[PDB]
Design a protein around this ligand. Sequence first.
Ligand SMILES: [Zn+2]
Length: 865
Amino acid sequence: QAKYRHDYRAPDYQITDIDLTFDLDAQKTVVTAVSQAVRHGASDAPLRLNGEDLKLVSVHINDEPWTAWKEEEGALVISNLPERFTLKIINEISPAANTALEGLYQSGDALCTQCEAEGFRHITYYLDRPDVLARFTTKIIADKIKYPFLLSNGNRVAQGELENGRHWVQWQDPFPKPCYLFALVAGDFDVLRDTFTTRSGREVALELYVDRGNLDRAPWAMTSLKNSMKWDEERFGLEYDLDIYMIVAVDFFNMGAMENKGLNIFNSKYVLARTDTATDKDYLDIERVIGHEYFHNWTGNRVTCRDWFQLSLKEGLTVFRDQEFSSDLGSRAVNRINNVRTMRGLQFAEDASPMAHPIRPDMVIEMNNFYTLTVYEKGAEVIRMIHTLLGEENFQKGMQLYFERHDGSAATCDDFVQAMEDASNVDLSHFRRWYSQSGTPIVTVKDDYNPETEQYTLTISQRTPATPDQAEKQPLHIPFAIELYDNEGKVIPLQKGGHPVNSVLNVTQAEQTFVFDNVYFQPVPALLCEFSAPVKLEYKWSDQQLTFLMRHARNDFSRWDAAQSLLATYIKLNVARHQQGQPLSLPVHVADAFRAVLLDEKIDPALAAEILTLPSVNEMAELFDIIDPIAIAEVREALTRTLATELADELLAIYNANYQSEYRVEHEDIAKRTLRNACLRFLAFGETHLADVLVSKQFHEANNMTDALAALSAAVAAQLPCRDALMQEYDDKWHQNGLVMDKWFILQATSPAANVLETVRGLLQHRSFTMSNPNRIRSLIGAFAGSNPAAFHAEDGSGYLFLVEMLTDLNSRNPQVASRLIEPLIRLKRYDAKRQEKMRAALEQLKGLENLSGDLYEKITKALA
Ligand SMILES: [Zn+2]
């Protein structure tokens, strides 16, 4: 049932225009689709239309009832057609019965759609493939009282009233598009309207639709949209191309958001915010996602994907764009740090799992299973490597050539690389292998300083371990950025033979040496600067080299990275000790390094905050071949407690110094607050009474949700006396707000308490929880299985049994959310034999489920192989 990239073949038929009519009703919606088709293939080829769960009413060709057709599994095959003709299909669908949230479905009282990857075929029989671009016109007919707003892509070109309290609106989107970009929304909303005038003077009407009563949480998203539009103009020279830009925030949505042309549909978590309900993180995430979907207007919509194996063509590039947007507007160092934590702690884990795949997949069973950390985040790292090799100027020339050549078409990853190569004259032939090879490369570095010749030599090797999907691995073109520092922290000019050498080394062979002369003093190297390539670095650092970099490295990312390498050594040491029943051991000079960060009056608070944020349990897991989740969790707490004790006075001093009476969603303020709360994490583990008072005080005195949640999280993390009271107070105050309660469910699910599973199971009956909402599911069940590996991997196997129960429900209800939740279970080979046995048993139980979804089937099969 798997489909392969190498089987791509141009369509036998194209549809150039489609006129849709929806007679809307939650129980029974009637769809009438009139398509203008043109044959491109053999004259005897039948037209094969994709369709899922549709009730066919009639088929006409040029108004003639058609008798030469047959329905087969997932398709409508029409034979003996003319070269050009008008196809008319009438079918019925039932939005209310759509619990998978794919196609046209119900979200609360509203009706909305999600068509990517292949959801449009759940609406009508069509050429549901992205290389078929048609001009859409959409007429919507519905009850006026229940659905006063009827929206689709483009501009409103017609509207009217009908008998029996019904009305209609017709939309026209002039830009040809693949059907995955089709969108329809119907319902009653509050609307925030604003305007943005492009650089050339185009006035764009901005409209943000939210559920009634949510207007007080819409301004930030609107502000972010305008910021996104302005930034794309300034940085990429791109302007919006339509007259209106609509965004609809819905409560039931499997994805974070969707870039439907001129009518984006967003999961409300990435839209709604006000100071008492949203944290600094929420604000920055809303900025990131609003920008992301907007950036897709060019990288995804004006230039789309030829086939789904090319998904990264738009996702990797658009993620790169949203990272550059966030970085330009805020702290580049903090953004880079956050994105590298995601790569090392989450994406590396995926590349080391049964689901490993190159950013451009070669084999797919269920395409929705490929909207991954790999396709998105590693995809962006690959785009960033191109940027690193070309430089901003040539990168932009590449973007320009890409649009000149492919604007208005469906392209491939190769087309993009070719545009970059042609515009810059930089050979990316070898570089292309990054698109075809899965797994994380390991770069080993050995060095030598020769005082006799004053030369520094780097011997660099690379290798990518085989993965389940590929037995063959080859060397890649790895941009390896370096910087050399003398004893005083000054940069040593890179040169050889009297000629300067670029700091970005081209590591293209299995092994090679790089010689630098005129190195008058033994240098301390900064390697893989700014995480120049998505690889694991193996270099025999001395603790002093690392603390030296923490104090002298020019780029703040290097300082944080050095601290990570320093901590890695001792996290590994102490996990081994834990398995031997021994307590934490840490050399004095290590605690000294963090004390120095706290007392450094010149360091950016933004950087200090990240250095003082210990790697997560998932980040820590990637430092080990075989994961011991319990040892990792206990060591993380022990490390927190030790630093809390050794730095008690300094932590409190910095906590107080960064107090801010005014709350501002401004980067300098966010940095100080992030630092203050980073200190709070440690202070929560100080003398019980002292910690309990400090934490309870912040929760009650907080004038924003960032500080309130930080305090609540600390109470849970340290199991402080005030915990139960604060948690109940939060529940009583916010139970009616799902997005706010999600933070609470996450805290319950990731609690270090011994009875966490019992609590989580009980919360399935909580008034704020429901299996019908993906956000609730992910915040409670997903957080438990994926963010509390220590509890999920309880030795008795209770965690696996719980997940099996939940997946048994979700497999039938919502396969996509079920597939997101099964990920922790497919990582079984990273655990001990006893755990593997229990996890395999759990997977075998799921494998035998009646009506097993393709989504789960694909992952279960790979995990059990
Ligand atoms: Zn995207």
